[PDB]
């Protein structure tokens, strides 16, 4: 289908619609494609799963259901007319679609139209109600009665097919069809009057049945075996978890870039048991307040640096103006987009992408000059006092940018030279 990365890149109108839906993706699009000059094909090539998510969101429809059984008219009846319900009725009933397609633009307007459609005999007839001859309905829609009957016979013709043999009761009734016994009672014949004409409950059963086979064929759209279904697994072997076990072998290697004796440890054990059974002194442990003073010096030396870190233990409040702040934010964001595309370039490992790496490296050099002239402008317009903040803030991304340049240069000298 239209599910390949090529087709997702091809659906430019869908790209247009989702771009118009988003806002920061718009701003990124003008800065890259319109301002910097990024080709669209590799703009969206980093956003293929998001394109797919939007395509799935747009390209889905709902289950069919009986609009008629659900919807009740509730004296002009009030209607909560939904265009989704209208199209539900339309592709539920092509007779209603054909009655629509020649009446709104040619004969009468839309509100008088759907007023006649609620008024009509075919409304309550195709609705879960036997049609009454007392009802006047809509005489214009009464011309569609024999057209819908033609549709009924045509749909019955296309639905009719040879029946699976074991299920088929026609084989049972035609097993001995030459039986001349006695017919059953009035009980077993269908509900008819004294004139023999039926009530039509078999007809409405046919209609709801035909609704179920329209559901079956809606499933059965573009979008031997008897032995297995007659086989019984009740007295058979259960399914075995064929899952593989895992065993471990463990040998940790030691790190890559004096010994006391048994006599020594025995005599020290002897000494420390002698001291333990000898004496414990309570107040001998108090330090001499100079070695304790150096202890305090070391502790407060730790405390000063660690609490200075703990002084700095939505984002933080900034002294930048909002225009310069957003400009450095968006330039940082698009330079991150460049560098992610550069990792796409370098980690591709293809000679095919060499001119892409070259032209993008020119774009990155332009980004470098943009950053330098940006820092120069903030320097000369602010006296460096917050341009220091701007440069320190944008420092790590340009550091990784320089890392990318040094990798490209070093690898260029490795393979070329």
């Amino acid at each position: 289908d239209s599910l390949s990365k090529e087709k997702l890149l091809t659906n430019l109108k869908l790209q247009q619609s989702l771009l118009k839906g988003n806002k920061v993706l718009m701003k990124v699009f003008q800065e890259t494609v319109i301002n910097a000059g990024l080709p669209p094909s590799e703009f969206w090539s980093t956003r293929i799963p998001l394109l797919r998510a939007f395509a799935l969101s747009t390209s889905q429809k709902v289950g069919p259901y009986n609009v008629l059984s659900t919807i009740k008219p509730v004296n002009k009846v009030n209607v909560n007319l939904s265009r989704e319900k209208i199209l539900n009725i339309f592709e539920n009933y092509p007779i209603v679609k054909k009655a629509y397609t020649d009446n709104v633009p040619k004969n009468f307007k839309e509100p008088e139209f759907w007023a006649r459609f609620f008024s009509s005999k075919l409304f309550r007839k195709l609705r879960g109600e036997k049609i009454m001859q007392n009802d006047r309905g809509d005489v214009i829609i009464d011309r569609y009665l024999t057209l819908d009957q033609e549709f009924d016979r045509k749909d019955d013709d296309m639905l009719l097919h040879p029946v699976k043999k074991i299920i088929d009761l026609d084989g049972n009734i035609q097993d001995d069809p030459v039986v001349r016994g006695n017919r059953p009672d009035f009980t077993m014949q269908p509900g008819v009057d004294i004139n023999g004409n039926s009530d039509g409950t078999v007809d409405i059963l046919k209609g709801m049945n035909r609704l179920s086979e329209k559901m079956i064929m809606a499933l059965k759209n573009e979008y031997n075996d008897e032995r297995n279904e007659l086989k019984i697994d009740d007295l058979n072997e259960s399914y075995k978890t064929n899952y593989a076990i895992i065993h471990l072998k463990r040998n940790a290697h030691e790190k890559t870039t004096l010994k006391v004796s048994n006599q020594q440890m025995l005599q020290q054990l002897s000494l420390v048991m002698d001291n333990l059974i000898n004496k414990l002194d309570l107040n001998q442990v108090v330090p001499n307040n100079e070695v304790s003073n150096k202890i305090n010096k070391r502790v407060i030396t730790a405390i000063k640096i660690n609490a200075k870190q703990a002084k700095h233990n939505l984002e933080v409040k900034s002294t930048l103006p909002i225009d310069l702040l957003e400009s450095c934010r968006m330039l940082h964001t698009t330079c991150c987009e460049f560098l992610k595309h550069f990792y796409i370039h370098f980690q591709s490992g293809e000679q095919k992408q060499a001119s892409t790496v070259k032209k993008l490296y020119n774009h990155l050099k332009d980004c470098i000059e943009k950053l330098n002239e940006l820092f120069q402008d903030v320097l000369n317009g602010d006296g460096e006092s917050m341009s220091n903040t701007c440069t320190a803030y944008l420092k790590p991304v340009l550091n990784s940018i320089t890392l990318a340049t040094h990798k490209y240069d070093e690898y260029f000298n490795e393979y070329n030279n």
Binding site: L12, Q16, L19, K20, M26, Q30, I34, P40
Partner: peptide
């Protein structure tokens, strides 16, 4: 507002211009 529409419809004809060329 309206100002996004002339941007994206100029880009519609720009994509067609590179499509024919």
């Amino acid at each position: 507002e309206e100002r996004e529409n002339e941007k994206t419809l100029n880009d519609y004809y720009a994509a067609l211009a590179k499509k024919q060329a």
